[PDB]
Design a protein around this nucleic acid. Structure first.
Ligand code: AKG
Ligand code: MN
Length: 201
DNA sequence: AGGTAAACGT
DNA sequence: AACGGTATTACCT
């Protein structure tokens, strides 16, 4: 297995993917993708949006899970039932049957886009897993340990692959290497990732 | 005290 | 281009 408390479910979301993608488009029609600017002033290469009660955002003074889209000043769109259902099935298969996400971060990767090694650790209740769904073009996912310099595993994540981490591995560093250009029948020229969290109480 | 931002050179 | 420095600090609460 990937790590203690972590698993990859290869092609788990393959059958659900078309509906998931129609739903990504619906969410982005209300809260559009945007490349966020870090506190340090750099524009991220990944374009993002959110759905559910809480959305990950940067602001000048740090990061924040907020109920309001700072670009539209309206609540993030509701989490699509398709998203919620897939998440629940994936979490159950991964051994986390009780997971209730309240936040879905939607990442869009154009060629060259990356996410440098980081930890998901600003959720108040770290008991809950992360469920991470890959769609479209393939990407190299890095998955390490509690320390930034712990040895990395590098795993190709393909369309429909779902990765779940929690328990002992909940705070592990992970990231995405710059996306290779290519074609996919469903997304054409990009990769999407759906990241489900319980971000509030 | 402790939290936490982080996305260039070799 | 895989690995690691940087936050080895400057601020908040
Ligand atoms: O795109 C991925 O596979 C990972 C995304 C991620 O780590 C995040 O959204 O926090
Ligand atoms: Mn992450």
């Amino acid at each position: 297995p990937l790590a203690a408390g972590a698993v990859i479910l290869r092609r788990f979301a393959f059958n659900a993917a078309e509906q998931l993608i129609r739903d990504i488009n619906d969410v982005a029609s209300q809260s559009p993708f945007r490349q966020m600017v870090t506190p340090g002033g750099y524009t991220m290469s990944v374009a993002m949006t959110n759905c559910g009660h809480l959305g990950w955002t940067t602001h000048r003074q740090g990061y924040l899970y907020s109920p309001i889209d700072p670009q539209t000043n309206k609540p993030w769109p509701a989490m699509p039932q398709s998203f919620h259902n897939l998440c629940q099935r994936a979490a159950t298969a991964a051994g986390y049957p009780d997971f209730q996400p309240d936040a879905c971060l939607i990442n869009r990767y154009a060629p060259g886009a990356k996410l440098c090694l980081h930890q998901d650790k600003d959720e108040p209740d770290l008991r809950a897993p992360i469920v991470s769904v890959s769609l479209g073009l393939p990407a190299i996912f890095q998955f390490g340990g509690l320390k930034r310099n712990d040895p990395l595993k590098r795993l190709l994540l393909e369309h429909g692959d779902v990765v779940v981490w929690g328990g002992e591995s909940r705070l592990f560093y992970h990231g995405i290497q710059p996306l290779k250009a290519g074609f996919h029948p469903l997304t054409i020229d990009c990769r999407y990732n759906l990241t489900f969290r319980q971000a509030g109480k």
